[PDB]
Amino acid sequence: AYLLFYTEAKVAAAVK
Amino acid sequence: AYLLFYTEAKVAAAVK
Amino acid sequence: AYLLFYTEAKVAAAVK
Amino acid sequence: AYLLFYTEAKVAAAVK
Amino acid sequence: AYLLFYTEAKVAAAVK
Amino acid sequence: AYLLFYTEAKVAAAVK
Numbered sequence: 001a002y003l004l005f006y007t008e009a010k011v012a013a014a015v016k
Numbered sequence: 017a018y019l020l021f022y023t024e025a026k027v028a029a030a031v032k
Numbered sequence: 033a034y035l036l037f038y039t040e041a042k043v044a045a046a047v048k
Numbered sequence: 049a050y051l052l053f054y055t056e057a058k059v060a061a062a063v064k
Numbered sequence: 065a066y067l068l069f070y071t072e073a074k075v076a077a078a079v080k
Numbered sequence: 081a082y083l084l085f086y087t088e089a090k091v092a093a094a095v096k
């Protein structure tokens with residue numbers, strides 16, 4: 001799995 | 017587009 | 033341009 | 049000291 | 065567990 | 081001071 005920080009603003013995290 | 021930081025280590029960025 | 037994450041708290045993003 | 053970004057969501061920062 | 069980005073430089077990630 | 085993560089790639093950090 002990847003660790004992911006993403007935003008378009010708040011930064012949200014996800015582990016996919 | 018969304019700004020993305022990702023890693024499996026080095027953190028890398030992308031703009032998608 | 034640069035991608036920037038910054039904070040003094042919430043992390044905010046910018047593309048400059 | 050180390051710079052730290054952490055989350056369980058909102059990403060938060062710390063300088064320890 | 066927490067998702068963690070940390071640095072003293074390279075940013076490294078960890079999931080604790 | 082601000083904590084800054086930035087990149088044009090590797091993510092680098094600064095405290096200003």
Ligand SMILES: [Cl-]
Nearest residue numbers: 009010011044
């Ligand atoms: Cl916001």
Ligand SMILES: [Cl-]
Nearest residue numbers: 025026074076
């Ligand atoms: Cl590495």
Ligand SMILES: [Cl-]
Nearest residue numbers: 039040041042
């Ligand atoms: Cl605060």
Ligand SMILES: [Cl-]
Nearest residue numbers: 010012057058
């Ligand atoms: Cl939230």
Ligand SMILES: [Cl-]
Nearest residue numbers: 073074075092
């Ligand atoms: Cl380095």
Ligand SMILES: [Cl-]
Nearest residue numbers: 087088089090
């Ligand atoms: Cl490159």
